[PDB]
Amino acid sequence: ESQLQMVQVTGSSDNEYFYVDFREYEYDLKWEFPRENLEFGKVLGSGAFGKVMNATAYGISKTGVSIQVAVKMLKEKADSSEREALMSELKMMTQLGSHENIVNLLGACTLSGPIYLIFEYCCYGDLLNYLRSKREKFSVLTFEDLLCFAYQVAKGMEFLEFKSCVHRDLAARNVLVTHGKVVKICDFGLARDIMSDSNYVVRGNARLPVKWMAPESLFEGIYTIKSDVWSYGILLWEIFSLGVNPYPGIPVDANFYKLIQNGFKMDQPFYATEEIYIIMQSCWAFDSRKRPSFPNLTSFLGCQL
Numbered sequence: 001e002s003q004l005q006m007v008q009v010t011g012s013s014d015n016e017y018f019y020v021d022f023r024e025y026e027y028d029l030k031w032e033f034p035r036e037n038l039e040f041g042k043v044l045g046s047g048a049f050g051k052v053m054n055a056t057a058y059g060i061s062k063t064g065v066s067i068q069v070a071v072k073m074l075k076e077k078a079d080s081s082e083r084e085a086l087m088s089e090l091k092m093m094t095q096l097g098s099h100e101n102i103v104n105l106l107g108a109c110t111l112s113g114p115i116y117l118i119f120e121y122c123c124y125g126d127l128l129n130y131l132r133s134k135r136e137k138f139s140v141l142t143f144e145d146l147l148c149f150a151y152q153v154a155k156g157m158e159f160l161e162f163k164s165c166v167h168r169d170l171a172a173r174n175v176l177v178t179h180g181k182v183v184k185i186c187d188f189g190l191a192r193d194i195m196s197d198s199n200y201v202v203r204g205n206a207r208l209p210v211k212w213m214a215p216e217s218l219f220e221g222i223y224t225i226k227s228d229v230w231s232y233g234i235l236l237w238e239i240f241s242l243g244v245n246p247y248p249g250i251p252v253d254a255n256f257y258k259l260i261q262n263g264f265k266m267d268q269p270f271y272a273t274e275e276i277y278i279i280m281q282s283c284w285a286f287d288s289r290k291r292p293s294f295p296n297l298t299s300f301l302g303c304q305l
């Protein structure tokens with residue numbers, strides 16, 4: 001199941017909404033891409049039931065010009081139920097529209113065999129590992145780069161809000177990096193190693209990114225765009241600490257739930273100004289109504305002078 005979800009609001013309060021399921025809608029065949037034109041490199045990431053692989057795609061955006069892509073597909077085992085979820089995700093992406101700060105869909109392969117979802121290739125990998133690799137080479141990474149990253153992510157989330165979407169797993173690990181230090185919001189859970197990664201906690205059918213979740217998500221299972229603001233705040237702490245695990249040194253257990261519930265907030269990270277930290281704290285307002293909006297955040301980050 002995709003952590004990126006389209007929703008429809010049915011009331012003024014947080015819990016009044018439902019998730020849009022594209023299972024019954026029809027797939028627009030204009031996205032179909034010839035399978036024989038995918039020369040696969042090798043794996044970029046692997047989940048329990050699916051993986052994203054390197055691939056060279058010829059003709060997908062300019063004839064005579066072959067480019068590199070990332071192809072989300074199902075694992076060698078592939079019973080019918082798993083494929084419909086990949087189809088539903090595909091359909092949703094076809095209807096989202098493209099944006100610079102989103103890992104965009106480029107095409108798909110669904111007819112003559114196994115399902116391939118073709119996305120942009122991001123040659124610098126995920127933002128988390130990117131920042132951690134620049135811990136030595138920092139002043140090469142600068143403060144403005146951090147501010148630009150923050151801005152681009154907020155822009156991407158603004159686009160998702162405009163498209164009535166929510167991202168139930170927003171974190172620096174789900175942000176990718178390309179040319180021009182451009183970052184794109186992504187979502188892989190079907191192709192994410194979800195539990196050798198200790199940031200996800202298994203609870204029934206759910207795999208919860210606990211340290212990134214708003215209280216209403218943690219305690220009531222409510223996911224709104226304001227939940228994303230909370231998660232964005234956490235992601236901000238990741239950026240301006242150069243990739244430190246949130247609530248460093250604090251284990252995910254029953255005590256953690258009590259901490260968040262009682263209003264625990266992280267301290268100012270080293271590479272952040274007092275202004276940026278004030279913004280973080282507003283994202284971590286317990287009452288979802290008091291958190292800033294992504295249009296607010298996106299505008300304010302004209303701080304890059």
Ligand SMILES: */C(=C\C(=O)N(C)[C@@H](C)C(=O)NCCCC#Cc1cnc(Nc2ccc(C#N)cc2)nc1NCCC)CN(C)C
Pocket residue numbers: 044045052070072103119120121122123124125126176179186187188191
């Ligand atoms: C480009 C720099 C460059 O080419 N490198 C630094 C090379 C040496 C390199 O090894 N890059 C890092 C490879 C690790 C990676 C990756 C990666 C890239 N793109 C995706 N895209 C993607 C798209 C959609 C989904 C979904 N759903 C998932 C992923 N994914 C990954 N890794 C997957 C886990 C993050 C600059 N240049 C051209 C000089």
